[PDB]
């Protein structure tokens, strides 16, 4: 049995910042989604265009697992038709998204007493992100006459900020690990099926 390697995504030691979110392509494998419970304690999920109870019956052309960390009160932005600072500048789901969004509290792993400053998000952008677009630029935006020379300052704006997750925050400000499962269905032979099929 050649199971899809969902463990690589869900049990990754460290997750990506949302601005630099990771993508794992899942093809040519049997998708046993039941393994998600073994890796994500107390997870929550929403699905769009698929019923979760029939996932082990369905076949798809390819599957994509995108993963990253955001704070709890931003998880609602990871849904089709949403706008906000994460949806607009960091990670964007299309209105017609077919897939599931899985999120779980990672305070124990991703908070630090002084703040975890390794997880970042983008503050501003020339235009909103397109569906599944990824912007990892760190260029300081030069608004005035004086060149910035990689130094933030007057008229020189850093595009990214740290979350600074600390274990003393309420849940809305605690870190959540998020995996977005995309179920791609082309008019083409399926390569990812559930174990039942």
């Amino acid at each position, epitope marked *: 049995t050649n199971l899809c390697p969902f463990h690589e995504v869900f049990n990754a030691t460290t997750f990506a910042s949302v601005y630099a979110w990771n993508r794992k392509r899942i093809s040519n494998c049997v998708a046993d989604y039941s393994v998600i419970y073994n890796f994500a304690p107390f997870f929550a999920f929403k699905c769009y265009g698929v019923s979760p109870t029939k996932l082990n019956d369905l076949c798809f052309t390819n599957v994509y697992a995108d993963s990253f960390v955001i704070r709890g009160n931003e998880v609602s932005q990871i849904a089709p038709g949403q706008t906000g600072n994460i949806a607009d500048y960091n990670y964007k789901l299309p209105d*017609d998204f077919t897939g599931c969004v899985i999120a779980w509290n990672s305070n124990k792993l991703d908070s630090k007493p002084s703040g975890n400053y390794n997880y970042l998000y983008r503050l501003l952008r020339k235009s909103k992100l397109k569906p599944f677009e990824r912007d*990892i630029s760190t260029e300081i935006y030069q608004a005035g006459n004086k060149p910035c020379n990689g130094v933030a300052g007057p008229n020189c704006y850093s595009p990214l900020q740290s979350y600074g997750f600390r274990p003393t925050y309420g849940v809305g400000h605690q870190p959540y690990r998020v995996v977005v499962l995309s179920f791609e269905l*082309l008019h083409a032979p399926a390569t990812v099926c559930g174990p039942k099929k």
Partner: antibody
Amino acid sequence: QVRLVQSGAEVKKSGESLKISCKGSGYSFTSYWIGWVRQMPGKGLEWMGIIYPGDSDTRYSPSFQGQVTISADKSISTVYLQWSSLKASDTAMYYCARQWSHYTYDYYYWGQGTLVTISS
Amino acid sequence: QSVLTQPASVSGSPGQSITISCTGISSDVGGYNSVSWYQQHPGKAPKLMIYDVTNRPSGVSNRFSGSKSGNTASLTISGLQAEDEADYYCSSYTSSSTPPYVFGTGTKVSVLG
């Protein structure tokens, strides 16, 4: 069913303006880039540019930058190609096309093409 | 803006295999990429034959295959038949490049009778 329907053939005089269209149906029109492709008679395909109808973000090929205007009217699910002053070299078949899915970038969906003939 | 160079023409007899090269492809390991092949008959819109370098849409004959080596992609057409006579275009996509899409110079396939 993803469909791209283009406007009919155009016969124009040199120096006239023109706006041709490409209407999308059967999918979320504001969630996908649409591309335009030129093919002069007996020549190859040339990618002209793309527009995202949701916010009219546009990316022109270096060879068509400033040579044509791509626009969108999302309220009627339509994108356009427009010239201010046609030249004889604009005689071509023009196609709109869309990528297969959010994850498959190749152009699987094609409009039926609009023939543009510039003649004296 | 880099050209993808294809031979202007290739020919074969019915039943042979023929190959079409497409040289000059670049990618961005940090972005999205694809290599495609399109078939175009006279008076018709292009049709996607190979996508993501090696894959076929449903209904495209498995006589068509694609591959890539270094900067060069190749289409092979085995069991060549008269209906294969057409123009073929390779194409590359790279999300971060200007332009992001490029069509190759085009190849006329002749099926010798």
